[PDB]
Amino acid sequence: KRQWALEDFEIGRPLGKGNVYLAREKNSKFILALKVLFKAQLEKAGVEHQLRREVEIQSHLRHPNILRLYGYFHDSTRVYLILEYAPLGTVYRELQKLSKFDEQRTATYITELANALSYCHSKKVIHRDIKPENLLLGSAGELKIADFGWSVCGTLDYLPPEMIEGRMHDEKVDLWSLGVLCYEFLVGKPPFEANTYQDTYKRISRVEFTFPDFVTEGARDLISRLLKHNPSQRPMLREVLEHPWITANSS
Ligand SMILES: N#Cc1cccc(Cn2cc(NC(=O)c3n[nH]c4cc(-c5cn[nH]c5)ccc34)cn2)c1
Hints:
Layout: E1 9-16, E2 20-25, E3 30-38, H1 39-43, H2 48-59, E4 69-74, E5 78-83, H3 91-98, H4 103-122, E6 135-137, E7 143-145, H5 161-164, H6 172-187, H7 197-205, H8 217-226, H9 237-241, H10 244-249
Antiparallel strand pairs: 1-2, 2-3, 3-5, 4-5, 6-7
Helix pairs in contact: 4-6, 6-8
The structure holds ligand 2VU.
Ligand 2VU is lined by residues 15-16, 20, 33, 35, 67, 83-87, 89-90, 136, 146-147.
């Protein structure tokens, strides 16, 4: 499995913050991403078990639309995660430049994500934290799931009424997330977005959303199908991949 230390990698530009830095393995010249987690931070938050879960889950996941976790290592105060480098950055950054995506680009990201989520659910692994900042873009502009920190409570967006209400939940949480993600992709903002945490809770709880005029009948239908209060009423990933709007606009 290879034994690693800090003295094996040349650190560079910070790629993101939660931090993750650009790194080069000195011997192989291998470009990767180093997520640097402080032990004292994980101690004062009691999330050490949650990190182990993420490490165990992502290291055994193998799919072209899932970012690879090559390995881990720790020192006296820090914990390091050797992650795959996504050359084209986050989906969040992309959406900020473009404002919103077209039906073609949206349906392709949805397909790529639904496929990756189906691979995850077949292994009984539920993502729970699907959002643009946790999604990356590979060398070919393919969508890739990066963060797996909540795999098996800041912004409520993307979380279904089950999780926010503390009730038990299925793989269906990721289907709701898919619906939130499809809307955000086409509109430019998530469907339950509010100024306060308290208002976002109400928007989610009572499923309040309205489509702007430009959102098409086909896109409206899939989003409506995915944003159901009852998780049993949510369509399966196979139903989404074979949805008319998806197949008509997907690559
Ligand atoms: N300035 C600038 C700029 C503008 C455009 C493109 C790029 C290239 N770019 C590549 C990345 N890649 C990553 O950020 C990245 N690559 N691999 C990652 C893994 C995680 C990660 C954190 N937890 N789990 C995974 C998080 C982030 C990453 C970001 N920008 C940089």
